[PDB]
Enzyme design. Structure first.
Site, PDB file in Angstrom:
ATOM      1  N   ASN A 197      29.874  32.370  38.086  1.00 38.19           N
ATOM      2  CA  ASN A 197      30.530  31.727  39.203  1.00 38.19           C
ATOM      3  C   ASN A 197      30.502  32.687  40.381  1.00 38.19           C
ATOM      4  OD1 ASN A 197      31.912  29.544  40.311  1.00 38.19           O
ATOM      5  ND2 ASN A 197      33.604  29.606  38.839  1.00 38.19           N
ATOM      6  N   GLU A 256      40.300  30.289  30.397  1.00 43.84           N
ATOM      7  CA  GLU A 256      40.579  31.377  31.343  1.00 43.84           C
ATOM      8  C   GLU A 256      41.915  32.016  31.040  1.00 43.84           C
ATOM      9  OE1 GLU A 256      40.087  28.920  35.048  1.00 43.84           O
ATOM     10  OE2 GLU A 256      38.510  30.379  35.471  1.00 43.84           O
ATOM     11  N   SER A 287      37.795  38.479  32.436  1.00 43.61           N
ATOM     12  CA  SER A 287      36.909  39.565  32.849  1.00 43.61           C
ATOM     13  C   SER A 287      36.317  40.252  31.630  1.00 43.61           C
ATOM     14  CB  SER A 287      37.617  40.598  33.728  1.00 43.61           C
ATOM     15  OG  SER A 287      36.666  41.327  34.488  1.00 43.61           O
ATOM     16  N   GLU A 321      41.707  28.956  40.296  1.00 46.28           N
ATOM     17  CA  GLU A 321      42.085  28.973  41.708  1.00 46.28           C
ATOM     18  C   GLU A 321      42.410  27.537  42.175  1.00 46.28           C
ATOM     19  OE1 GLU A 321      38.782  31.452  41.506  1.00 46.28           O
ATOM     20  OE2 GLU A 321      38.820  29.785  40.072  1.00 46.28           O
ATOM     21  N   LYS A 325      31.633  33.342  43.929  1.00 45.24           N
ATOM     22  CA  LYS A 325      32.801  32.899  44.643  1.00 45.24           C
ATOM     23  C   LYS A 325      32.705  33.298  46.108  1.00 45.24           C
ATOM     24  CE  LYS A 325      35.479  31.199  41.205  1.00 45.24           C
ATOM     25  NZ  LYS A 325      36.336  32.149  40.431  1.00 45.24           N
ATOM     26  N   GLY A 385      45.193  39.413  38.326  1.00 40.36           N
ATOM     27  CA  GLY A 385      46.098  39.986  39.311  1.00 40.36           C
ATOM     28  C   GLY A 385      47.315  40.633  38.671  1.00 40.36           C
ATOM     29  N   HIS A 427      39.025  25.196  37.224  1.00 38.47           N
ATOM     30  CA  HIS A 427      39.063  26.654  37.326  1.00 38.47           C
ATOM     31  C   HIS A 427      40.371  27.065  37.988  1.00 38.47           C
ATOM     32  CE1 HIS A 427      36.321  25.128  40.484  1.00 38.47           C
ATOM     33  NE2 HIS A 427      36.991  25.949  41.274  1.00 38.47           N
TER      34      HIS A 427
END
Length: 234
Positions: A10, A154, A200, A84, A12, A160, A82
């Site tokens: 992906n 995910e 990740s 976001e 971005k 974060g 996804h």
């Protein structure tokens, strides 16, 4: 890790050089590679990317004309749900289910993302959130439609947050998802389904992660190390 794995990337936000790198990457084993991008960069990617094991994905469709436009532009894959989109733009479970159903109905292979937040995990609500999300999706589909569907888990709780995920934990999540689909859709569908890890991941730990059962590939970022992530799907 029995059905054909998928390595998806992906982008971005240069792409030129990354497409070159991928074009010159040799892949000995069977695996469906995917390059997802935003609208602006679909064009360059279509023009330049040519590797037999690679297809192009879109990221978002506002309406059904967009799906038809993409289909017309020769794009058959899409990535939906996804994080976001769920957490930044408040796409509800139901909105996503509909997009997925819409996409499938319009001829797409869909990569549908699910995953819980840190609060949600820490409160012990991983299974209820994750399974509530996937249930919403399923509600809008039939058994036949699952052939056109891929799940990406995910681990939103590790975004974060400085948190990191162990493969045991990734496995557990994927396993739980599989269990649900087996018991609610059918074992046959569960056997064919691909659940990708969308946390990740670097080359090193991707091989070890793929070694788990129930992991069928990755949703990852478009970067040089994606090459290693592809490699990690033997």
């Amino acid at each position: 890790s029995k059905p054909q794995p998928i390595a998806a990337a992906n982008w971005k936000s240069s792409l030129s050089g990354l497409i070159d790198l991928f074009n010159s990457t040799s892949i000995n084993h069977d695996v469906q590679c995917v390059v997802a991008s935003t609208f602006v960069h679909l064009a360059m990617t279509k023009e330049r990317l040519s590797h037999p094991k690679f297809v192009i994905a879109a990221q978002n469709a506002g309406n059904t004309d967009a799906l038809a436009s993409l289909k017309d532009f020769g794009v058959n894959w899409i990535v939906l749900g996804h994080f976001e989109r769920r957490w930044y733009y408040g796409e509800t479970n139901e909105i996503v289910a509909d997009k997925v159903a819409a996409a499938v109905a319009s001829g797409f292979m869909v990569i549908a993302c699910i995953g819980e937040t840190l609060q949600e995990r820490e409160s012990g609500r991983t299974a209820v959130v994750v399974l509530t999300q996937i249930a919403a999706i399923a509600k809008k589909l039939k058994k036949a439609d699952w052939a056109k569907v891929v799940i990406a888990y995910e681990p939103v709780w590790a975004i974060g947050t400085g948190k990191v995920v162990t493969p045991q934990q990734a496995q557990e999540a994927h396993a739980l998802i599989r269990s649900w689909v087996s018991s609610k859709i059918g074992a046959d569908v569960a056997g064919e389904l691909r659940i990708l890890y969308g946390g990740s991941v670097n080359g090193k730990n991707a091989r070890t992660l793929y070694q788990q059962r129930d992991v069928n590939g990755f949703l990852a970022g478009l970067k040089p190390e994606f090459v290693d992530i592809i490699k990690a799907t033997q």
